[PDB]
Symmetry: C4
Subunit: 252 residues, 4 copies
Amino acid sequence: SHMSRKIRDLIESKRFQNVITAIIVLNGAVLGLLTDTTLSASSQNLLERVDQLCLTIFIVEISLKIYAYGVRGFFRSGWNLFDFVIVAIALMTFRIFRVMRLVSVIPTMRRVVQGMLLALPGVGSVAALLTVVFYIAAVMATNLYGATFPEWFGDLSKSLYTLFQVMTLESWSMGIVRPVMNVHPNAWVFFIPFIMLTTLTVLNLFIGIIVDAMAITKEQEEEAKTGHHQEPISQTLLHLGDRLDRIEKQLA
Amino acid sequence: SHMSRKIRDLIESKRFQNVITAIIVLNGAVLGLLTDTTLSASSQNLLERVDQLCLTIFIVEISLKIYAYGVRGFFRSGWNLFDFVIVAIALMTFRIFRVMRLVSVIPTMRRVVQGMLLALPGVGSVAALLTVVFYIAAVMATNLYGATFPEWFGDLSKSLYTLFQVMTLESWSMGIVRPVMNVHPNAWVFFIPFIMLTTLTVLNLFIGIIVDAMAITKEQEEEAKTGHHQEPISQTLLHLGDRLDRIEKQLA
Amino acid sequence: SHMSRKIRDLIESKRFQNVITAIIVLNGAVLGLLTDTTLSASSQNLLERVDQLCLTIFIVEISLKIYAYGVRGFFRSGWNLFDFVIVAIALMTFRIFRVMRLVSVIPTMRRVVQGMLLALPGVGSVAALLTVVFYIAAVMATNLYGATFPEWFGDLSKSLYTLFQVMTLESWSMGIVRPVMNVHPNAWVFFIPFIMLTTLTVLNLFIGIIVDAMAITKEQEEEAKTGHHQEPISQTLLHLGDRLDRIEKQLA
Amino acid sequence: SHMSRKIRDLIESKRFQNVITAIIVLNGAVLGLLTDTTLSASSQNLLERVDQLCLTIFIVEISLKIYAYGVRGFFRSGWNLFDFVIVAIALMTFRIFRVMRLVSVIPTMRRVVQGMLLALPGVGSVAALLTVVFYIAAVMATNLYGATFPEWFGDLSKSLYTLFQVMTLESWSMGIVRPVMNVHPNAWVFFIPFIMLTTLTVLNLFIGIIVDAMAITKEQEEEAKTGHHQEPISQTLLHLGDRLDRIEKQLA
């Protein structure tokens, strides 16, 4: 009650954030050392104890939190939920995903991720268009080339894999298209438009994400620092037409 | 008449759009399953029936439309025409192109495509410049390298293919230019400027398309939601000089 | 005199521009057909006559021009000069460069090229920085790797070639850096920073050219259509502070 | 005193800058000629003398400077310090780094570098996010693939190297992922998301650096030319609301 409020003053301090950070890093360094196959059984045992400890400190932390905010208002944050699952799941195979908590706990990092997630809706149609082009290209490539080139095109899955490699431009010619053209001389009529269209569309997708993500993140950094953001130049002129219509009705 | 108007209320509903969408997807899923060579004759027969059905539902749809708008005002839309050809052509070899109708029927997808098409005119000159550079490079590479490297440069078509691969940077050095230089030591004087100029110009082309397409699509999304778009800051200041010249002539 | 002025009305017409264009294309198509080694001697002889003709029409054109403007005011245009050299040089080895005249004669194409040239000064320092990084990297790579990898690094020229290939990311790892690391295990400490720095800087160079070129070309298209361009929003507000300081000194 | 002030008039002249530049270039040309292994002992001896001379002229220069500004106000500039270390270090293995002084001495070049350095803080979080993704990916790839593919993934360092190559898209499929999938058929589920996420994030990182660096450098070029820069449109409208609130309180 006064307890509830004094704990939150802990939870929300600089020093406590620094301590959870330091433990994420330590847990991460330890999962890193464990990839090393040459370790003694004792070394591995130790490292596995440091990990147990790290996981334990996280349970407390989360408890401190589920308490000092209650079940309703902890689980009202996606980051709390994510922190929750991440930690809880470890009480039941890629443990190293725990290092993602550097993102949930460091606010400037969290704001980068939020900008990117929030940008995803407005490129949904560019992405769907890419999806449709892939699907169509993969069906045609399977029918065209599957019998003569089955490792690359022998079924839909193979085709999609190969076309993704082709869109990334990786050995698309020496490794895929020239060998195809030795058997199907006009295959460039398929592959060259595929490349032009997917590279255009994937860059549209990337640029749209990045331009929006950056604008979102920047507003969030403003709000977090000062409680508000910059009004769009649009509003500034909208509102400049409220105070000019009034200065003209005054001026009569 | 009241019929004409009640059908359009169908045609233009949310639910009917959802139903045509669902049938495109189904037709697409089925052309996908058909790429699989291992299918029984019965399985193939069935799938081919589902496709026949899908095509049939599309004929009705289009009929519902050519009617409820008349021959003049259906064929006044490029999307209707495209839908028309796409569907009609199937009554006479890449059927999977029918999945492009996800674009013509879903409005946010249609607006992405429209932005891109509408951006094409204003990069026409950058594209023509790329075309001219290719043509010249391919003539020179044929004359320079065609006799000693005929698989890559033996004729104009070969040269253009190879240069396109070179502009995409795919094995341009280990696979093409170093082998060329073993016979023609100064060939880097050709290939390195080619790469610098085409990569600059193709990126100019891509960026111009994308920046314009995005601005067009965004206005179209505004118009579609609210019947108008944002006036350019330019007009907002143009018009701010109409109301400032009048507030100064009032103020005398 | 009235002749001078009536010729210019030819020179500057739409139809005459279309005719010079058509001849450039024809000359280009013919230099293209000549790359084909299989041609009869008669075919080659003919084609070579069409080229002679094309060159001749260009001499007239230029004459019509050097006349109707005089030696001083023809050679006052870089495009006229370029047209001049291009054509004159053919009266004394890459003839196909004549197709560059599509650029000098078509105004929208000329404006693309002008934007790019005019953008070059303002990226001069980014380019010089790239140059310095290359030079330093190539000296170090020669000293580090020249004795053990002389085909790639054996002298300064080899090094620069290889590093250019490395900056384009072409086989930089499977083909160059992994083989280097088998002999020099820490070579990634050289190559990975090289890549990060040159890819950052070359993209800075590209983006700077393109952003400026596009703004320049767009002003030139405005001027060419209407005799003026859009004032920068800056001037529009500068000038909005001239008419607001006067409306406040009026308002006293 | 009047000496102090007359020397600075040297130090800060155009001609003296041109002379230090010319000596950097000469020192650089000479370290370049020295990479050549075929040189006589006399040639090498000479070149090594030209370098000794170059280094000597630099000691004077720096002395002229440490004097005419004093120990406090020379070492108050990062460029002076950099110049200082660079030159002093040569009095005790990559000498060619001395050519970096073209950057410290030429002001437009220095302003390019400053924009880039100054842009680094505001992408710190995007970079940290890339770092975290790498670290996690490398731990997982080591555990997943290290035993079956130890040259690429056998330990954390190997994994990071390979993943960096994969993010650059260099042979990522023909050279790494297809061979991995022959043993681990679902490995595309790891590698394809890795590529999508790192290419998105590294481009975010690059674009953020470049957009900021260019805006910073451009303000610095303004300040250096005229003692001030352009006020942000924001301030121009902020301040346009100071003079509109006063013109409305006047107008009462």
